[PDB]
Amino acid sequence: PGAPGSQGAPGLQGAPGAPGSQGAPGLQ
Amino acid sequence: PGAPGSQGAPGLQGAPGAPGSQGAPGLQ
Amino acid sequence: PGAPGSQGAPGLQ
C-alpha cells in the first residue's frame, strides 16, 4: 500500500518563467 | 510497498506561457 | 482499481 516516493501529483509547470520587456512601438 | 519510483515528473514546458519578444522600438 | 496517473494537465498558456 504505502510507497513513499511513488508517483504523486504529475509534474505541471514546475518552473514557470516569464517574458521580459515586450516593448512597444513608441516611435515615428 | 506500492510501485517504486512511479513518479512521472515531466519537467518540460511548465513555464512558457505568454510568448512573444517584440520590444517594438520607439522613441524618435 | 489502480491509479490513473496523469490523464490531463490543468492550466493554459
Added chain:
Amino acid sequence: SQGAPGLQ
C-alpha cells in the same frame, strides 16, 4: 509514511 514534495 507519505513523504512527498510537489507542484509549485
